[PDB]
């Protein structure tokens, strides 16, 4: 998306169109369409203005109803309360949640967790690696069923994988630095792709703690 | 009940090969005055009007005004299972949607087919009668060759009717050319003129219109100011066949 910006120092801007276009996936993004979806509702105007003063009064009542609808949408959809809570949980300012993506927030939380043990971040940049293999899907038994099927699933799958096997930048073991120490049992583990990762009796990672705060 | 009998099935086969390319569906208005039809083409450009008068059928019988819905492709496939000398009778009920055709050889062999009709929701249009001011009566073979020969050059053609004769011109990327024709039985080109005419028409429609050439020897072309050009054929003591096409602006 390509937008213009206008400079105002001290004051904050919240166009509700950009908030809708970022959070919601709808069919039309007109004010009439979202006011029906959430609440329930040029050349004529030039002759309502070149006429009399009750026509201009009708034009003003129309304009005031237009200027009133986004306030009702802002307070009804719990926009601003969620923006304040997002800025308090992540630690980024209130203008960054309308301009940026999801990188500045995870950079911010990782730096705020990095000052408490004394580490510095490096700069690696590469163009470019390859893809890796994603997720499995099981082959169906296609059709129509009329005997009950029960669904069992895991909740918060990938953050709990990253939590409970002690995976982090700061505990990734390089292939050589295990050698020539031979202590495998309860000092490190091995993954199906092939890496070795140190047990939690030596280090605690930084991404487990950020994830645990977000999960709570 | 409807039942007709006609001795020259060749006339029926020529009229059904006039129309099987331009039209896919039609409605036959069976009356006590004959068998009459109007239709527009599939492209919504041109009009056909066909009249087979009641007398020329050599055994006619119609009780009540009918309206039959015919797929012209299946009928054109049926009427080529009949040789050029047979005698054709048509048999229809007034309660049914299925037509019977019986072909009688002039020697031991008789054939009979049944064809399912369809109900259609078409609207019937017509024409008003005015006096077209340029009246050409010309041989049909020359008109067929003139249209087919100008067709390879470009797609439009301008008709230019002047005093002694008419002149057809056509252009294209490989050049241009005209053909004259002058006032001088059926190999003549009779030309009546009150006001001169010059107009432009596209060639694909004209090469559709010249598909019914074995129906007669001569063809009649009628023109006037800003009206659809009329192409007219006559069928001997049976009726006529007219195509209608609008000029380009």
């Amino acid at each position: 998306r390509d937008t213009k910006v206008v400079s105002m120092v001290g004051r904050v801007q919240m166009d509700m169109l950009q908030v809708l276009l970022r959070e919601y996936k709808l069919r039309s993004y007109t004010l009439n369409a979202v006011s029906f979806h959430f609440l329930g509702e040029h050349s004529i105007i030039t002759d309502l203005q070149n006429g009399n003063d009750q026509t201009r009064r009708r034009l003003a009542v129309y304009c005031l109803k237009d200027a009133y609808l986004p306030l009702r949408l802002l307070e009804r959809l719990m926009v601003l309360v969620n923006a304040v809570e997002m800025a308090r949980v992540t630690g980024v300012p209130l203008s960054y949640l309308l301009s940026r993506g999801q990188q500045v927030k995870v950079v911010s939380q990782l730096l705020r967790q990095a000052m408490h043990e004394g580490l510095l971040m490096p700069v690696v940049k590469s163009e470019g690696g390859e893809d890796y293999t994603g997720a499995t899907v099981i082959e169906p038994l296609k059709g129509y069923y009329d005997v009950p099927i029960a669904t069992l699933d895991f909740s918060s799958l990938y953050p709990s994988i990253m939590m409970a096997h002690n995976l982090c930048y700061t505990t990734l073991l390089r292939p050589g630095t295990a050698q020539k120490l031979g202590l495998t049992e309860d000092q490190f583990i091995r993954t199906p792709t092939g890496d070795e990762f140190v047990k939690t009796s030596v280090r605690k990672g930084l991404l487990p703690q950020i994830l645990e705060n977000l999960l709570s | 009940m409807f039942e007709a009998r006609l001795v020259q099935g060749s006339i029926l086969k020529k009229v059904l090969e006039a129309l099987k390319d331009l039209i896919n569906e039609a409605c036959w208005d069976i009356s006590s005055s004959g068998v009459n039809l109007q239709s527009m083409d599939s492209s919504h450009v041109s009009l056909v009007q066909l009249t087979l008068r009641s007398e020329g059928f050599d055994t006619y019988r119609c009780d009540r005004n009918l309206a039959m819905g015919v797929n012209l492709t299946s009928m054109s496939k049926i009427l080529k299972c009949a040789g050029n000398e047979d005698i054709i009778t048509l048999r229809a009920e007034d309660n049914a949607d299925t037509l019977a055709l019986v072909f009688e050889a002039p020697n031991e062999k008789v054939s009979d087919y049944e064809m399912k009709l369809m109900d259609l929701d078409v609207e019937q249009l017509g024409i008003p009668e005015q006096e077209y001011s340029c009246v050409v009566k010309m041989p049909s073979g020359e008109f067929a060759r003139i249209c087919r020969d100008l067709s390879h050059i470009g797609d439009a053609v301008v008709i230019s009717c002047a005093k002694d004769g008419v002149k057809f011109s056509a252009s294209g990327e490989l050049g241009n050319g005209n053909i004259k024709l002058s006032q001088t039985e059926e190999e003549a080109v009779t030309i009546e003129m009150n006001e001169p005419v010059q107009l432009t028409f596209a060639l694909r429609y004209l090469n559709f219109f010249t598909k019914a050439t074995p129906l007669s020897s001569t063809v009649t072309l009628s023109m006037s100011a800003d009206v659809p050009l009329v192409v007219e054929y006559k069928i001997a003591d049976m009726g006529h066949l007219k195509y209608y096409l609008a000029p380009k602006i």
């Binding site: 998306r1 390509d2 069919r27 039309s28 993004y29 007109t30 009439n32 369409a33 029906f36 509702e41 004529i44 296609k142 059709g143 129509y144 | 409605c27 208005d29 009356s31 109007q38 527009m40 599939s42 492209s43 919504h44 450009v45 041109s46 009009l47 009540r64 005004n65 009918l66 309206a67 369809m118 109900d119 259609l120 929701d121 078409v122 609207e123 019937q124 249009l125 017509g126 024409i127 008003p128 659809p228 209608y244 096409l245 609008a246």
Partner: protein, 216 residues
């Protein structure tokens, strides 16, 4: 309407509608990132479904026909053949394509201006000279043919009134004109076609005489 080069790489319908400006307004047109609405009209260019697309307001004000065969075989048919097959066999494909077949045989629709207003019999559809509604063979059954179609005029009258007074309650006022051409409201252009249905069905019943005098 996404980034313009991927839509340069291969010809689409909505890109063709957007990049084709209007004569009325070369200053309001879709930009990058928004949604383009269109409908498909009927024509004879079968190689390209990107040559038959038009703006909904333009086909509203200029009254172009609709390609019912496009919508029948390309939009509707294959999702139905996904859903309805697994409960039955392939006689179910034949069952819905036969339920089409009993119902496919009912269709409704330069030189086009020179119509002679050819009248037609209401009973058996035979074009004939004179303005009377009934045919000479189907004259006895005329009370039943008047009975039939006045229950259609009666149901069009009931639909005019429910719609044109709903605009008065959505507008606010009962004493002034309605001006709302809201393209996202079903109310608009459903209130436009019933005027013409009623215009047509009222004139078909004046084929029959008047039920009495009016100048007494």
């Amino acid at each position: 309407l996404t980034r313009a080069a991927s839509d340069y790489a291969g010809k689409q319908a909505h890109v063709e509608l957007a990049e084709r400006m209007r004569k009325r307004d070369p200053g309001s047109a879709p930009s990058l990132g928004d949604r383009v609405p269109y409908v498909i009209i009927s024509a004879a260019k079968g190689v390209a479904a990107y040559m038959k697309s038009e703006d909904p307001l333009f086909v509203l004000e200029h009254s172009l026909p609709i390609d019912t065969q496009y919508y029948l075989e390309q939009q509707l048919a294959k999702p139905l053949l996904r859903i309805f097959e697994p409960i039955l066999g392939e006689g179910r494909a034949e069952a819905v394509l036969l339920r089409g077949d009993h119902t496919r045989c009912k269709t409704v629709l330069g030189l086009l201006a020179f119509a002679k207003r050819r009248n037609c019999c209401i009973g058996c559809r035979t074009v004939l000279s004179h303005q009377g509604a009934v045919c000479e063979f189907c004259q006895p059954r005329e009370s039943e043919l008047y009975q039939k179609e006045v229950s259609h005029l009666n149901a069009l009258e009931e639909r005019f009134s429910r719609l044109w007074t709903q605009c008065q309650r959505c507008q606010g006022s009962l004493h002034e004109d309605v001006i709302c051409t809201s393209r996202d409201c079903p109310i608009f252009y459903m209130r436009k076609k019933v005027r013409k249905d009623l215009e047509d069905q009222e004139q078909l019943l004046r084929r029959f005489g008047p039920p009495g005098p009016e100048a007494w």
